[PDB]
Design a binder for these strands. Structure first.
Length: 682
RNA sequence: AUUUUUG
């Protein structure tokens, strides 16, 4: 079964996620909405949690700011989105297609809401105060304008088809009648800062009640009759739990609300640092609340929570899903207030994937949001067991490499040229090399030390073209540019080539360097004596990989796959040149194998540890291709990404499973057997 | 208030 590590739920949106009974959850993320099946219908083992990422609403060209399902029986498949691209779209989630849309707003849309009473009414609000009422299924629209203020949220009454509550940036809360040109029926005064959330009481009559949540740290309950406040709940200041959190990153309160139709005398809200509270409205003056996951530790959110969406499953479980700045989507069991499960998300390109050969299945992911992920992919009760590492990172993690033998030892490299060393078994900050790369760290590799270094050294390749040799025990010490050793050993006069890739042979006897001009150079230990130059690519080399040493034939370990900014992949066999061990280098100009098919640059190639000469490649053409390299046969093509692939890694235990990562902020785990397409698009 | 003209 495939898996998806999706883009992070968007931040600072009053309503950018929702859920329908059954059930289905949708959350805005970047330019799309992701769909997640929850409950019995997810078809999961009694061990693992019952959810699956099943869909994507694709079409917006800019940030999705709002999302809302229809909650009319028989039309749960319909939903609406707003976007910074200026449009409001109506979607059918069954087909994942646009039913109809409008571009009536001329200013940045703030939010929108599907009317609970009128089947085809979608009400949206923008930054200038303009409200549009949209009856999509009769082609109708009405503009309303109340106050010249920035709308933060709005919520149609669940009881009265004409009444809509609007909350503004300055704290104004109004209840308007859209049949009366938007006339203000109630002007609710009391809040001193942004309204983040408006929830109507699910029960009519006291009239009706409604609750507003504000950045001013108050939740206010109002009487819809007497147009005045009848209850003020102030958030409790609580001791920070769980997350050892980066203090510097700025973050103020987001106070969102959930008023359960299940239990009208309870009210759920967010709190400082992403805690969730269940308020007891009967004990108003005592300000009684119960903390979510107050018993368990490390289960609560670590940063502010933006959206809360109730979901009753068909086996009558009362769930509540929470989105958060901490990039976890959490599912809460209302009956127990415990976190049933957590779905991690990515806030940047997935630049890098590396499987530990020490802890099988431990998959490190280098992400553009400055956090290293470690996914225990073989966790039994959890398909998304992921730990985050943020200390000493900050920038985009563009390169990763596990140590060959030492548990928890993970090298990483960043977009600002930094090279660091993590002990993921600890929570101590990483050691950072004192020597920086001028540009992005594109590759990291462990290998035998070479002079003047004084059992394995760390090699790093940066975008400026230098390969550094670091002493993992002396990271604060100096790192050596191996170009000096190359130069001396090979007596070179002219300027050395710009190195763009480094890859050590599995035995650690041979080092291959890819260069910017397309050439690949083959050096042998201990002095990096050049024994061979390969001239095949004529653009920058992005990736090089040596076949493993446990195939049916030992000779296979001399197979070397390579990808560059051209779409064609080559395989070279260095048995002859390496065994002959020449005193002057050989120039190779003919490929041992030639793999054609992709239509864009190659970012990563990897050999299956389960087969002989089986290669997977990742390309900017948006696909990962699995080849029988020996036969030059294109076996299967994965097209699940919507962006350009940046990395790929074979599962260590499952010959059918591969992981890939792209600039769509997604990591996919997919099955070669579920892939019917044989080759890239042509 | 993160969401990359960027291997």
């Amino acid at each position: 079964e495939p898996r998806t590590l999706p883009p992070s739920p968007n931040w600072y949106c009053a309503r950018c996620s929702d859920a329908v009974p059954g059930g289905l959850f949708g959350f805005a993320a970047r330019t799309s909405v992701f769909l997640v099946r929850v409950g019995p219908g997810a078809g999961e083992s009694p061990g693992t949690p019952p959810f699956r990422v099943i869909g994507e609403l694709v079409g917006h060209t800019e940030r999705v700011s709002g999302f809302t399902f229809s909650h009319h029986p028989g039309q749960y498949n319909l939903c609406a989105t707003s976007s910074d691209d200026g449009t409001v779209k109506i979607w059918d989630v069954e087909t994942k297609t646009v039913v109809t849309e409008h571009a009536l707003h001329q200013h940045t849309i703030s939010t929108l809401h599907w009317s609970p009473r009128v089947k085809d009414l979608i009400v949206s609000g923008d930054e200038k105060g303009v409200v549009f009422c949209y009856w999509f299924n009769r082609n109708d629209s009405q503009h309303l304008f109340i106050e010249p203020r920035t709308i933060f949220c709005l919520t149609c009454s669940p009881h009265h088809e004409d009444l809509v509550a609007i909350g503004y940036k300055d704290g104004i809360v109004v209840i308007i009648d859209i049949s009366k040109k938007g006339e203000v029926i109630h002007r609710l005064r009391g809040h001193d800062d942004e309204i983040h959330s408006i929830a109507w009481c699910p029960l009519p009559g006291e009239g009706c009640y409604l609750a507003t949540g504000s950045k001013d740290q108050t939740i206010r309950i109002w009487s819809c009759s007497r147009g005045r406040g009848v209850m003020i709940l102030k958030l409790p200041f609580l001791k920070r739990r769980g997350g050892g959190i980066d203090p510097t990153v700025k973050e103020r309160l987001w106070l969102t609300l959930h008023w359960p139709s299940n239990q009208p005398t309870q009210l759920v809200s967010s709190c400082f640092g992403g805690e969730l509270l269940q308020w007891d409205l009967t004990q108003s003056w005592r300000r009684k609340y119960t903390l979510f996951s107050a018993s368990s530790e490390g289960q609560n959110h670590s940063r502010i929570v933006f959206n809360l969406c109730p979901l009753q499953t068909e086996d009558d479980k009362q769930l509540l899903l929470s989105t958060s700045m901490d990039r976890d989507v959490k599912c809460w069991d209302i009956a127990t207030l415990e976190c049933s499960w957590t779905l991690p998300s990515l806030g940047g390109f997935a630049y890098s994937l590396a499987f530990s050969s020490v802890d099988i299945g431990s998959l490190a992911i280098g992400v553009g949001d400055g956090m290293i992920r470690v996914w225990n992919t073989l966790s039994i009760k959890n398909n998304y067991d992921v730990k985050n590492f943020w200390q000493g990172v900050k920038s985009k993690v563009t390169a990763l490499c596990w140590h060959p033998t030492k548990e928890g030892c993970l090298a990483f490299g960043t977009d600002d040229g930094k090279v660091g060393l993590y002990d993921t078994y600890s929570n101590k900050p990483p050691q950072i090399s004192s020597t920086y790369h001028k540009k992005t760290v594109y590759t990291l590799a462990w290998g035998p030390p070479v002079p003047p270094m004084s059992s394995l050294a760390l090699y790093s390749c940066g975008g400026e073209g230098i390969v550094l040799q670091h002493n993992p025990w002396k990271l604060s010490g100096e790192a050596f540019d191996i170009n000096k050793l190359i130069r001396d050993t090979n007596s070179i006069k002219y300027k050395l080539p710009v190195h763009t890739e480094i890859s050590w042979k599995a035995d650690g006897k041979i080092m291959a360097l890819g260069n910017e001009d397309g050439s690949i150079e083959i050096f042998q230990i201990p002095n990096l004596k050049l024994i061979c130059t390969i001239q095949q690519h004529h653009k920058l080399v992005n990736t090089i990989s040596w076949h493993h040493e446990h195939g049916s034939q030992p000779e296979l370990s001399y197979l070397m796959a390579s990808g560059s900014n051209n779409a064609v992949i080559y395989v070279h066999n260095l048995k002859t040149v390496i065994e002959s061990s020449p005193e002057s280098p050989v120039t190779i100009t003919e490929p041992y194998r030639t793999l054609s098919g992709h239509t864009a640059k190659i970012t990563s190639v990897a050999w299956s540890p389960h087969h002989d000469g089986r290669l997977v490649s990742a390309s900017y053409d948006g696909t990962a291709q699995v080849w029988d390299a020996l036969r030059e046969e294109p076996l299967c093509n994965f097209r699940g990404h919507r962006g350009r692939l940046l990395c790929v890694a074979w599962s260590p235990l499952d010959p059918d499973c591969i992981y890939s990562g792209a600039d769509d902020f997604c990591v996919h785990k997919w099955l070669t057997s579920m892939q019917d397409h044989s080759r890239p698009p042509q």
